[PDB]
Structures are given as C-alpha cells and as structure tokens.
Amino acid sequence: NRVFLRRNVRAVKM
Amino acid sequence: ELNAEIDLQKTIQEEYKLWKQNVPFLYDLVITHALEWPSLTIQWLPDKKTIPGTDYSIQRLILGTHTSGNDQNYLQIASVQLPNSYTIEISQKIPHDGDVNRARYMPQKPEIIATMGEGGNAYIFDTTCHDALTTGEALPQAVLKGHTAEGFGLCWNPNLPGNLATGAEDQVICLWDVQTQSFTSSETKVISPIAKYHRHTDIVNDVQFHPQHEALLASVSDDCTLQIHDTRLNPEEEAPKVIQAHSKAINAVAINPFNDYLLATASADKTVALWDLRNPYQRLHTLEGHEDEVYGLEWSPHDEPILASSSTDRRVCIWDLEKIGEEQTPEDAEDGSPELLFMHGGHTNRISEFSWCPNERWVVGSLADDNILQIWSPSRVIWG
C-alpha cells in the first residue's frame, strides 16, 4: 500500500 | 478481529514514519495542527490578509465539532498563517445543536454559514452577529425544518443568493430559500422547504449545484444512482437524468468549474468516474488508485484538469486528467496510472474532509478523525 508515489520522489530528488 | 487491529496499528505506524522521511522530497509545504476537537467538515473562507513587511498571510477555515452528545458542539473559525507558516488559532466559537455534519458559507455573503445538524435540522448562522466565544447553547439565526434524519448533503446555489439544497439519510432532497434580511440577533427564524424531492431509495450523500447553471442540481446516493435535477420542474416527476453510475454506493459528486459538461463521482467501489453531461449514460473514464471507499471529491478551483479525492484508505490523491493515456516506463508504472499525479499519505486515521485553498495555488487543507489538521502543498517539481 503506497504511502507516496516513488516517481514523485525521483522527480524531486534530481 | 484482534489480529486485524494489531496489523492496522502497525502498518499505520510504519507508513507514517516512511512518509515523514520523504516529506522533504514531496512537499513545498506541510503544516500540522492538533485540534482540540475532531471536525467532520472543513472549508476555506474566501478572504486572505497579507501581513506587510512579512513573509506570511492570515487565512481562515470553517470547522465544527462532533462530541457525539457528551458536551456542547461548536461551529468554529480557525485563523491560520500561510507562507507568502506556523500558527493556528480558533478565532471564533459559535455554539451548535449537535454534531456539525457539514458547514458551508454563502458564496455571495461569506459571513452566512449553513450547517447540517441535530436530527436533520439545518441551521443558518450570521457569524458577525456572534461573539468570538459565547457562553451558552446554540442560538442560530434560522432553523431549516424539513429532514427527519441526520444528513451530510449541503450546497449553496452560487447563482441564486440564498438558494440552498440539502440531502439526508431520510432519502430526501430539500430546496430552500434563505432570506437573510428577515434575520435578527434576538430570535431564530423557522424556514421550511420550497420543494422536496423523493427521487432516491436510499441515503442521499451529496448534492451540488452546477456552477454555471442556476437550475441544475446533481445528487448521488447509496442507491447507486447519480441524478440530474432541473429545479424549475414538477418535483413529483422523475429527474431528467437518472444514471446508474456505479454498482456500489456513491458518496460524492463534483462538477468541473471550467468545463460545464464534466462531472465526477466517488464510490465505495474504490473508483472515481468521469462523466460528460451530453452523453450521461456511459462514463468517460475511471480513475483507479484508491484502496478503499472514496468519500471526498473536489475539483481544483484554479486548474481545469486537476481533481482531488480522499478515501478510507487514508490518502488524498490528486489526479491530472491531461496525463491520461500517457506512455509509462515499467518503473514509473509501479506507482499506478499516469493520471495519478500525487498521493498525500500524511494522515493516520480516516479522512473526514479536505478543501482546496482559494487564495493559493496547490494548497489543500485536510482533516482526519484523529484530530489532525494538515495544510500542505505538493512540490512544484511535481505539478509544474
């Protein structure tokens, strides 16, 4: 059960 | 089942800790307030107060209480600082008969607030006729006498001042004409409906007026229909459109404020369906991503393609309809469909209600049953 979208983090981290 | 409860508490604890760790890579803003009493309802008031010489402003939210019959219930107005970040304060408490099931300000007169309260009565308050903190029991400007059981559907007509629609667990929709001029501070007026609809066969969960058409009212029900009412017609007739929208209960409806034909529904079947009023009988699209019943639904007041939904899965999801059909990589597809723009997983109990901030782009206020108010903004990297 996702608590956040990993592609969101990938977009923000880089 | 004890094992289920043990597992739920453990997963919520682990998911929250994982969420806090990734907040810096997800949000431009997260503010958390622990409310003294949990609230079933939230709505931003339309006013913003810049504090000059400063990097914040003051904005306001409508809240209520639901003590469940123990103590006095209150309609409350909270003042919150927002970055142009920190404090909250209840700047007004107004005594209220029973749980505040829903509270809404009149678009044309924001100091007038309608609520859905005790046993189906609706109430009107003029908040400038009340002090900031008041001793006694409720003294509303008007009691709307009509429903015979508690209800959660409540909407003002944004094109006809004082025209209000309600829907409740008695399966009835009421229409009302609230004329504030007859009000006093002394006594409560009694208003009764100008029309009643008996067009549903189960609880009426949500009603909404069309933003650009004064006579169009949409309603959704536990009877699994979406109905479109023309408010000029014979109330005893069938609605002009009865839509078998979902196979399970429908909890919310939301009409797009930019595209007059576009409409969304939220269902216990875990999905949000999109509808075009020019072919209302088959849906345009199904938004899938929630893991449990969908309850809350609100289009962005600033961007036509953006929709938010909340669910008993404890998430608020933001959908970007322009990303429908877009090519994904396998690793990106692991998060779900591309039109799922952002997931807010900061709440730790069931979400009661949320509201888009009308004076700031990409700011949501959301409440959960564990007394937590969160004001947040996803990172501009995600939505820009």
JSON list of C-alpha atoms in Angstrom, two decimals, chain B residues 133-332:
[
{"chain": "B", "resi": 133, "resn": "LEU", "atom": "CA", "xyz": [-16.52, 33.00, 22.37]},
{"chain": "B", "resi": 134, "resn": "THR", "atom": "CA", "xyz": [-20.08, 32.54, 23.68]},
{"chain": "B", "resi": 135, "resn": "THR", "atom": "CA", "xyz": [-21.32, 31.14, 26.98]},
{"chain": "B", "resi": 136, "resn": "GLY", "atom": "CA", "xyz": [-24.50, 29.27, 26.29]},
{"chain": "B", "resi": 137, "resn": "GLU", "atom": "CA", "xyz": [-26.34, 26.94, 23.96]},
{"chain": "B", "resi": 138, "resn": "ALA", "atom": "CA", "xyz": [-26.85, 27.48, 20.24]},
{"chain": "B", "resi": 139, "resn": "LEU", "atom": "CA", "xyz": [-28.87, 30.47, 19.05]},
{"chain": "B", "resi": 140, "resn": "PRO", "atom": "CA", "xyz": [-28.94, 30.22, 15.25]},
{"chain": "B", "resi": 141, "resn": "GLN", "atom": "CA", "xyz": [-30.42, 32.89, 13.02]},
{"chain": "B", "resi": 142, "resn": "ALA", "atom": "CA", "xyz": [-32.59, 30.24, 11.35]},
{"chain": "B", "resi": 143, "resn": "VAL", "atom": "CA", "xyz": [-33.50, 26.58, 11.71]},
{"chain": "B", "resi": 144, "resn": "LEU", "atom": "CA", "xyz": [-34.36, 24.82, 8.44]},
{"chain": "B", "resi": 145, "resn": "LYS", "atom": "CA", "xyz": [-37.10, 22.34, 9.35]},
{"chain": "B", "resi": 146, "resn": "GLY", "atom": "CA", "xyz": [-37.51, 19.54, 6.84]},
{"chain": "B", "resi": 147, "resn": "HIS", "atom": "CA", "xyz": [-35.39, 16.41, 7.08]},
{"chain": "B", "resi": 148, "resn": "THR", "atom": "CA", "xyz": [-36.40, 13.70, 9.56]},
{"chain": "B", "resi": 149, "resn": "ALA", "atom": "CA", "xyz": [-32.90, 12.19, 9.93]},
{"chain": "B", "resi": 150, "resn": "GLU", "atom": "CA", "xyz": [-29.31, 13.42, 10.01]},
{"chain": "B", "resi": 151, "resn": "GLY", "atom": "CA", "xyz": [-27.71, 14.41, 6.71]},
{"chain": "B", "resi": 152, "resn": "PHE", "atom": "CA", "xyz": [-24.45, 15.38, 5.01]},
{"chain": "B", "resi": 153, "resn": "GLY", "atom": "CA", "xyz": [-25.56, 16.93, 1.70]},
{"chain": "B", "resi": 154, "resn": "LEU", "atom": "CA", "xyz": [-25.38, 20.72, 1.74]},
{"chain": "B", "resi": 155, "resn": "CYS", "atom": "CA", "xyz": [-24.76, 23.22, -1.07]},
{"chain": "B", "resi": 156, "resn": "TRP", "atom": "CA", "xyz": [-25.49, 26.88, -1.74]},
{"chain": "B", "resi": 157, "resn": "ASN", "atom": "CA", "xyz": [-26.53, 27.98, -5.21]},
{"chain": "B", "resi": 158, "resn": "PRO", "atom": "CA", "xyz": [-23.66, 30.20, -6.47]},
{"chain": "B", "resi": 159, "resn": "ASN", "atom": "CA", "xyz": [-26.01, 31.89, -8.99]},
{"chain": "B", "resi": 160, "resn": "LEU", "atom": "CA", "xyz": [-29.10, 32.45, -6.80]},
{"chain": "B", "resi": 161, "resn": "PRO", "atom": "CA", "xyz": [-28.34, 34.11, -3.44]},
{"chain": "B", "resi": 162, "resn": "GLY", "atom": "CA", "xyz": [-29.91, 32.27, -0.52]},
{"chain": "B", "resi": 163, "resn": "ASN", "atom": "CA", "xyz": [-30.97, 29.20, -2.53]},
{"chain": "B", "resi": 164, "resn": "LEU", "atom": "CA", "xyz": [-29.80, 26.08, -0.67]},
{"chain": "B", "resi": 165, "resn": "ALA", "atom": "CA", "xyz": [-30.06, 22.33, -1.31]},
{"chain": "B", "resi": 166, "resn": "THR", "atom": "CA", "xyz": [-29.78, 19.60, 1.34]},
{"chain": "B", "resi": 167, "resn": "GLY", "atom": "CA", "xyz": [-29.82, 15.79, 1.27]},
{"chain": "B", "resi": 168, "resn": "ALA", "atom": "CA", "xyz": [-30.02, 13.40, 4.21]},
{"chain": "B", "resi": 169, "resn": "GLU", "atom": "CA", "xyz": [-30.41, 9.79, 5.40]},
{"chain": "B", "resi": 170, "resn": "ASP", "atom": "CA", "xyz": [-34.20, 10.14, 5.08]},
{"chain": "B", "resi": 171, "resn": "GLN", "atom": "CA", "xyz": [-33.65, 9.76, 1.28]},
{"chain": "B", "resi": 172, "resn": "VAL", "atom": "CA", "xyz": [-34.96, 13.30, 0.66]},
{"chain": "B", "resi": 173, "resn": "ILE", "atom": "CA", "xyz": [-33.52, 16.35, -1.09]},
{"chain": "B", "resi": 174, "resn": "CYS", "atom": "CA", "xyz": [-34.82, 19.71, 0.18]},
{"chain": "B", "resi": 175, "resn": "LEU", "atom": "CA", "xyz": [-34.56, 23.04, -1.61]},
{"chain": "B", "resi": 176, "resn": "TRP", "atom": "CA", "xyz": [-34.65, 26.22, 0.48]},
{"chain": "B", "resi": 177, "resn": "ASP", "atom": "CA", "xyz": [-34.90, 29.99, 0.08]},
{"chain": "B", "resi": 178, "resn": "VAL", "atom": "CA", "xyz": [-32.88, 31.67, 2.85]},
{"chain": "B", "resi": 179, "resn": "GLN", "atom": "CA", "xyz": [-33.61, 35.41, 3.03]},
{"chain": "B", "resi": 180, "resn": "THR", "atom": "CA", "xyz": [-31.08, 36.92, 5.44]},
{"chain": "B", "resi": 181, "resn": "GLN", "atom": "CA", "xyz": [-32.85, 40.33, 5.62]},
{"chain": "B", "resi": 182, "resn": "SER", "atom": "CA", "xyz": [-35.52, 38.83, 7.89]},
{"chain": "B", "resi": 183, "resn": "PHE", "atom": "CA", "xyz": [-32.82, 37.86, 10.41]},
{"chain": "B", "resi": 184, "resn": "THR", "atom": "CA", "xyz": [-32.29, 39.34, 13.87]},
{"chain": "B", "resi": 185, "resn": "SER", "atom": "CA", "xyz": [-29.87, 38.71, 16.71]},
{"chain": "B", "resi": 186, "resn": "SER", "atom": "CA", "xyz": [-32.84, 38.18, 19.05]},
{"chain": "B", "resi": 187, "resn": "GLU", "atom": "CA", "xyz": [-34.71, 35.12, 17.79]},
{"chain": "B", "resi": 188, "resn": "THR", "atom": "CA", "xyz": [-34.38, 32.12, 15.48]},
{"chain": "B", "resi": 189, "resn": "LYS", "atom": "CA", "xyz": [-36.41, 32.15, 12.27]},
{"chain": "B", "resi": 190, "resn": "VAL", "atom": "CA", "xyz": [-38.10, 28.96, 11.09]},
{"chain": "B", "resi": 191, "resn": "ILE", "atom": "CA", "xyz": [-37.72, 28.18, 7.40]},
{"chain": "B", "resi": 192, "resn": "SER", "atom": "CA", "xyz": [-39.37, 25.27, 5.62]},
{"chain": "B", "resi": 193, "resn": "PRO", "atom": "CA", "xyz": [-38.51, 23.86, 2.17]},
{"chain": "B", "resi": 194, "resn": "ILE", "atom": "CA", "xyz": [-39.77, 25.42, -1.03]},
{"chain": "B", "resi": 195, "resn": "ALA", "atom": "CA", "xyz": [-39.55, 21.94, -2.62]},
{"chain": "B", "resi": 196, "resn": "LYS", "atom": "CA", "xyz": [-38.78, 18.35, -1.61]},
{"chain": "B", "resi": 197, "resn": "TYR", "atom": "CA", "xyz": [-37.63, 15.55, -3.92]},
{"chain": "B", "resi": 198, "resn": "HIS", "atom": "CA", "xyz": [-38.33, 11.91, -3.16]},
{"chain": "B", "resi": 199, "resn": "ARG", "atom": "CA", "xyz": [-36.21, 10.62, -6.04]},
{"chain": "B", "resi": 200, "resn": "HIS", "atom": "CA", "xyz": [-33.80, 8.33, -4.19]},
{"chain": "B", "resi": 201, "resn": "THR", "atom": "CA", "xyz": [-34.42, 4.99, -2.49]},
{"chain": "B", "resi": 202, "resn": "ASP", "atom": "CA", "xyz": [-31.52, 5.20, -0.02]},
{"chain": "B", "resi": 203, "resn": "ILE", "atom": "CA", "xyz": [-29.41, 7.77, 1.82]},
{"chain": "B", "resi": 204, "resn": "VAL", "atom": "CA", "xyz": [-28.65, 10.91, -0.20]},
{"chain": "B", "resi": 205, "resn": "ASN", "atom": "CA", "xyz": [-24.93, 11.51, 0.28]},
{"chain": "B", "resi": 206, "resn": "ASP", "atom": "CA", "xyz": [-24.09, 14.66, -1.69]},
{"chain": "B", "resi": 207, "resn": "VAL", "atom": "CA", "xyz": [-25.81, 17.42, -3.65]},
{"chain": "B", "resi": 208, "resn": "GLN", "atom": "CA", "xyz": [-24.18, 20.14, -5.74]},
{"chain": "B", "resi": 209, "resn": "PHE", "atom": "CA", "xyz": [-25.50, 22.97, -7.88]},
{"chain": "B", "resi": 210, "resn": "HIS", "atom": "CA", "xyz": [-23.99, 23.40, -11.30]},
{"chain": "B", "resi": 211, "resn": "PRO", "atom": "CA", "xyz": [-21.56, 26.35, -11.04]},
{"chain": "B", "resi": 212, "resn": "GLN", "atom": "CA", "xyz": [-22.80, 27.99, -14.28]},
{"chain": "B", "resi": 213, "resn": "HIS", "atom": "CA", "xyz": [-26.47, 26.95, -14.32]},
{"chain": "B", "resi": 214, "resn": "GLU", "atom": "CA", "xyz": [-28.83, 28.07, -11.54]},
{"chain": "B", "resi": 215, "resn": "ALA", "atom": "CA", "xyz": [-31.44, 25.36, -12.11]},
{"chain": "B", "resi": 216, "resn": "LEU", "atom": "CA", "xyz": [-29.21, 22.24, -12.40]},
{"chain": "B", "resi": 217, "resn": "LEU", "atom": "CA", "xyz": [-28.74, 20.19, -9.22]},
{"chain": "B", "resi": 218, "resn": "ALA", "atom": "CA", "xyz": [-26.76, 16.94, -9.10]},
{"chain": "B", "resi": 219, "resn": "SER", "atom": "CA", "xyz": [-27.25, 14.29, -6.41]},
{"chain": "B", "resi": 220, "resn": "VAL", "atom": "CA", "xyz": [-25.68, 10.93, -5.53]},
{"chain": "B", "resi": 221, "resn": "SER", "atom": "CA", "xyz": [-26.91, 8.23, -3.23]},
{"chain": "B", "resi": 222, "resn": "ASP", "atom": "CA", "xyz": [-26.39, 4.88, -1.54]},
{"chain": "B", "resi": 223, "resn": "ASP", "atom": "CA", "xyz": [-28.99, 3.64, -4.06]},
{"chain": "B", "resi": 224, "resn": "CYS", "atom": "CA", "xyz": [-26.12, 3.80, -6.61]},
{"chain": "B", "resi": 225, "resn": "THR", "atom": "CA", "xyz": [-27.63, 6.46, -8.88]},
{"chain": "B", "resi": 226, "resn": "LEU", "atom": "CA", "xyz": [-26.39, 9.83, -9.98]},
{"chain": "B", "resi": 227, "resn": "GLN", "atom": "CA", "xyz": [-29.36, 12.07, -10.75]},
{"chain": "B", "resi": 228, "resn": "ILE", "atom": "CA", "xyz": [-29.51, 15.45, -12.51]},
{"chain": "B", "resi": 229, "resn": "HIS", "atom": "CA", "xyz": [-32.41, 17.61, -11.37]},
{"chain": "B", "resi": 230, "resn": "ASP", "atom": "CA", "xyz": [-33.89, 20.61, -13.21]},
{"chain": "B", "resi": 231, "resn": "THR", "atom": "CA", "xyz": [-35.06, 22.75, -10.35]},
{"chain": "B", "resi": 232, "resn": "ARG", "atom": "CA", "xyz": [-37.73, 24.53, -12.42]},
{"chain": "B", "resi": 233, "resn": "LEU", "atom": "CA", "xyz": [-39.77, 21.36, -12.98]},
{"chain": "B", "resi": 234, "resn": "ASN", "atom": "CA", "xyz": [-42.50, 19.43, -11.14]},
{"chain": "B", "resi": 235, "resn": "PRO", "atom": "CA", "xyz": [-40.78, 17.97, -8.03]},
{"chain": "B", "resi": 236, "resn": "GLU", "atom": "CA", "xyz": [-43.02, 14.88, -8.11]},
{"chain": "B", "resi": 237, "resn": "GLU", "atom": "CA", "xyz": [-41.72, 13.86, -11.55]},
{"chain": "B", "resi": 238, "resn": "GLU", "atom": "CA", "xyz": [-38.65, 11.73, -12.17]},
{"chain": "B", "resi": 239, "resn": "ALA", "atom": "CA", "xyz": [-35.36, 13.57, -12.55]},
{"chain": "B", "resi": 240, "resn": "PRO", "atom": "CA", "xyz": [-34.47, 14.41, -16.19]},
{"chain": "B", "resi": 241, "resn": "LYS", "atom": "CA", "xyz": [-31.41, 12.12, -15.89]},
{"chain": "B", "resi": 242, "resn": "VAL", "atom": "CA", "xyz": [-31.10, 9.05, -13.68]},
{"chain": "B", "resi": 243, "resn": "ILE", "atom": "CA", "xyz": [-27.65, 7.50, -14.20]},
{"chain": "B", "resi": 244, "resn": "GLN", "atom": "CA", "xyz": [-26.70, 4.02, -12.94]},
{"chain": "B", "resi": 245, "resn": "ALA", "atom": "CA", "xyz": [-23.24, 5.36, -12.32]},
{"chain": "B", "resi": 246, "resn": "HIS", "atom": "CA", "xyz": [-21.69, 2.68, -10.10]},
{"chain": "B", "resi": 247, "resn": "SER", "atom": "CA", "xyz": [-22.62, -0.74, -8.80]},
{"chain": "B", "resi": 248, "resn": "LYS", "atom": "CA", "xyz": [-21.89, 0.33, -5.21]},
{"chain": "B", "resi": 249, "resn": "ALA", "atom": "CA", "xyz": [-22.85, 3.37, -3.13]},
{"chain": "B", "resi": 250, "resn": "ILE", "atom": "CA", "xyz": [-21.93, 6.82, -4.45]},
{"chain": "B", "resi": 251, "resn": "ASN", "atom": "CA", "xyz": [-20.64, 9.21, -1.80]},
{"chain": "B", "resi": 252, "resn": "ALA", "atom": "CA", "xyz": [-19.72, 12.41, -3.68]},
{"chain": "B", "resi": 253, "resn": "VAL", "atom": "CA", "xyz": [-20.32, 14.36, -6.88]},
{"chain": "B", "resi": 254, "resn": "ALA", "atom": "CA", "xyz": [-18.24, 17.28, -8.16]},
{"chain": "B", "resi": 255, "resn": "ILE", "atom": "CA", "xyz": [-18.97, 19.39, -11.26]},
{"chain": "B", "resi": 256, "resn": "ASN", "atom": "CA", "xyz": [-15.92, 20.84, -13.03]},
{"chain": "B", "resi": 257, "resn": "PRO", "atom": "CA", "xyz": [-15.88, 24.65, -12.60]},
{"chain": "B", "resi": 258, "resn": "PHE", "atom": "CA", "xyz": [-14.26, 25.25, -16.03]},
{"chain": "B", "resi": 259, "resn": "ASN", "atom": "CA", "xyz": [-15.76, 22.57, -18.31]},
{"chain": "B", "resi": 260, "resn": "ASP", "atom": "CA", "xyz": [-19.53, 22.86, -17.86]},
{"chain": "B", "resi": 261, "resn": "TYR", "atom": "CA", "xyz": [-20.17, 19.30, -19.10]},
{"chain": "B", "resi": 262, "resn": "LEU", "atom": "CA", "xyz": [-17.61, 17.47, -16.97]},
{"chain": "B", "resi": 263, "resn": "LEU", "atom": "CA", "xyz": [-18.67, 15.73, -13.79]},
{"chain": "B", "resi": 264, "resn": "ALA", "atom": "CA", "xyz": [-17.03, 13.30, -11.33]},
{"chain": "B", "resi": 265, "resn": "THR", "atom": "CA", "xyz": [-18.47, 10.72, -8.91]},
{"chain": "B", "resi": 266, "resn": "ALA", "atom": "CA", "xyz": [-16.87, 8.92, -5.96]},
{"chain": "B", "resi": 267, "resn": "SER", "atom": "CA", "xyz": [-17.97, 5.46, -4.91]},
{"chain": "B", "resi": 268, "resn": "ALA", "atom": "CA", "xyz": [-17.49, 2.68, -2.37]},
{"chain": "B", "resi": 269, "resn": "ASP", "atom": "CA", "xyz": [-16.30, 0.61, -5.38]},
{"chain": "B", "resi": 270, "resn": "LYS", "atom": "CA", "xyz": [-12.87, 2.43, -4.82]},
{"chain": "B", "resi": 271, "resn": "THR", "atom": "CA", "xyz": [-13.08, 4.48, -8.03]},
{"chain": "B", "resi": 272, "resn": "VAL", "atom": "CA", "xyz": [-13.83, 7.95, -9.33]},
{"chain": "B", "resi": 273, "resn": "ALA", "atom": "CA", "xyz": [-15.81, 8.02, -12.57]},
{"chain": "B", "resi": 274, "resn": "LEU", "atom": "CA", "xyz": [-15.82, 10.91, -15.05]},
{"chain": "B", "resi": 275, "resn": "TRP", "atom": "CA", "xyz": [-18.98, 11.85, -16.94]},
{"chain": "B", "resi": 276, "resn": "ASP", "atom": "CA", "xyz": [-19.95, 14.13, -19.82]},
{"chain": "B", "resi": 277, "resn": "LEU", "atom": "CA", "xyz": [-23.48, 15.52, -19.48]},
{"chain": "B", "resi": 278, "resn": "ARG", "atom": "CA", "xyz": [-24.02, 15.32, -23.26]},
{"chain": "B", "resi": 279, "resn": "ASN", "atom": "CA", "xyz": [-23.76, 11.51, -23.13]},
{"chain": "B", "resi": 280, "resn": "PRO", "atom": "CA", "xyz": [-24.53, 10.94, -19.46]},
{"chain": "B", "resi": 281, "resn": "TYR", "atom": "CA", "xyz": [-25.20, 7.19, -19.55]},
{"chain": "B", "resi": 282, "resn": "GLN", "atom": "CA", "xyz": [-21.70, 5.84, -20.13]},
{"chain": "B", "resi": 283, "resn": "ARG", "atom": "CA", "xyz": [-18.70, 7.16, -18.28]},
{"chain": "B", "resi": 284, "resn": "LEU", "atom": "CA", "xyz": [-15.68, 8.80, -19.92]},
{"chain": "B", "resi": 285, "resn": "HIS", "atom": "CA", "xyz": [-13.03, 7.28, -17.72]},
{"chain": "B", "resi": 286, "resn": "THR", "atom": "CA", "xyz": [-12.41, 5.52, -14.41]},
{"chain": "B", "resi": 287, "resn": "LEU", "atom": "CA", "xyz": [-9.76, 6.87, -12.04]},
{"chain": "B", "resi": 288, "resn": "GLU", "atom": "CA", "xyz": [-8.26, 3.93, -10.15]},
{"chain": "B", "resi": 289, "resn": "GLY", "atom": "CA", "xyz": [-5.74, 4.22, -7.33]},
{"chain": "B", "resi": 290, "resn": "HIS", "atom": "CA", "xyz": [-7.57, 4.26, -4.03]},
{"chain": "B", "resi": 291, "resn": "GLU", "atom": "CA", "xyz": [-7.50, 1.06, -1.98]},
{"chain": "B", "resi": 292, "resn": "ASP", "atom": "CA", "xyz": [-10.86, 1.53, -0.25]},
{"chain": "B", "resi": 293, "resn": "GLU", "atom": "CA", "xyz": [-14.09, 3.55, -0.46]},
{"chain": "B", "resi": 294, "resn": "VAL", "atom": "CA", "xyz": [-13.80, 7.03, -1.98]},
{"chain": "B", "resi": 295, "resn": "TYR", "atom": "CA", "xyz": [-15.71, 9.67, 0.02]},
{"chain": "B", "resi": 296, "resn": "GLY", "atom": "CA", "xyz": [-14.34, 13.15, -0.70]},
{"chain": "B", "resi": 297, "resn": "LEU", "atom": "CA", "xyz": [-14.13, 14.83, -4.09]},
{"chain": "B", "resi": 298, "resn": "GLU", "atom": "CA", "xyz": [-13.21, 18.38, -5.14]},
{"chain": "B", "resi": 299, "resn": "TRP", "atom": "CA", "xyz": [-12.06, 19.87, -8.42]},
{"chain": "B", "resi": 300, "resn": "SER", "atom": "CA", "xyz": [-9.21, 22.35, -8.22]},
{"chain": "B", "resi": 301, "resn": "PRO", "atom": "CA", "xyz": [-10.65, 25.90, -8.29]},
{"chain": "B", "resi": 302, "resn": "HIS", "atom": "CA", "xyz": [-7.57, 27.02, -10.27]},
{"chain": "B", "resi": 303, "resn": "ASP", "atom": "CA", "xyz": [-6.82, 24.34, -12.90]},
{"chain": "B", "resi": 304, "resn": "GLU", "atom": "CA", "xyz": [-9.40, 22.64, -15.13]},
{"chain": "B", "resi": 305, "resn": "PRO", "atom": "CA", "xyz": [-7.65, 19.20, -15.36]},
{"chain": "B", "resi": 306, "resn": "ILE", "atom": "CA", "xyz": [-6.88, 18.76, -11.62]},
{"chain": "B", "resi": 307, "resn": "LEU", "atom": "CA", "xyz": [-9.10, 16.71, -9.27]},
{"chain": "B", "resi": 308, "resn": "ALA", "atom": "CA", "xyz": [-8.55, 15.59, -5.66]},
{"chain": "B", "resi": 309, "resn": "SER", "atom": "CA", "xyz": [-10.20, 12.66, -3.90]},
{"chain": "B", "resi": 310, "resn": "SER", "atom": "CA", "xyz": [-10.00, 11.19, -0.42]},
{"chain": "B", "resi": 311, "resn": "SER", "atom": "CA", "xyz": [-10.74, 7.70, 0.78]},
{"chain": "B", "resi": 312, "resn": "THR", "atom": "CA", "xyz": [-10.96, 5.46, 3.80]},
{"chain": "B", "resi": 313, "resn": "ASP", "atom": "CA", "xyz": [-7.53, 4.19, 2.63]},
{"chain": "B", "resi": 314, "resn": "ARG", "atom": "CA", "xyz": [-6.24, 7.36, 4.45]},
{"chain": "B", "resi": 315, "resn": "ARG", "atom": "CA", "xyz": [-4.88, 9.01, 1.27]},
{"chain": "B", "resi": 316, "resn": "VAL", "atom": "CA", "xyz": [-5.74, 12.17, -0.59]},
{"chain": "B", "resi": 317, "resn": "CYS", "atom": "CA", "xyz": [-4.97, 11.67, -4.29]},
{"chain": "B", "resi": 318, "resn": "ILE", "atom": "CA", "xyz": [-4.53, 14.40, -6.91]},
{"chain": "B", "resi": 319, "resn": "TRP", "atom": "CA", "xyz": [-5.40, 13.44, -10.49]},
{"chain": "B", "resi": 320, "resn": "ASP", "atom": "CA", "xyz": [-4.15, 15.23, -13.62]},
{"chain": "B", "resi": 321, "resn": "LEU", "atom": "CA", "xyz": [-6.58, 14.43, -16.45]},
{"chain": "B", "resi": 322, "resn": "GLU", "atom": "CA", "xyz": [-4.11, 15.65, -19.09]},
{"chain": "B", "resi": 323, "resn": "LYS", "atom": "CA", "xyz": [-1.80, 12.74, -18.25]},
{"chain": "B", "resi": 324, "resn": "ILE", "atom": "CA", "xyz": [-4.48, 10.15, -19.20]},
{"chain": "B", "resi": 325, "resn": "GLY", "atom": "CA", "xyz": [-3.13, 7.77, -21.84]},
{"chain": "B", "resi": 326, "resn": "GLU", "atom": "CA", "xyz": [0.48, 8.83, -21.47]},
{"chain": "B", "resi": 327, "resn": "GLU", "atom": "CA", "xyz": [3.29, 6.34, -22.07]},
{"chain": "B", "resi": 328, "resn": "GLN", "atom": "CA", "xyz": [4.93, 4.99, -18.91]},
{"chain": "B", "resi": 329, "resn": "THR", "atom": "CA", "xyz": [8.10, 3.11, -18.12]},
{"chain": "B", "resi": 330, "resn": "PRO", "atom": "CA", "xyz": [7.76, -0.12, -16.12]},
{"chain": "B", "resi": 331, "resn": "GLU", "atom": "CA", "xyz": [9.36, 1.50, -13.09]},
{"chain": "B", "resi": 332, "resn": "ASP", "atom": "CA", "xyz": [7.02, 4.50, -13.28]}
]
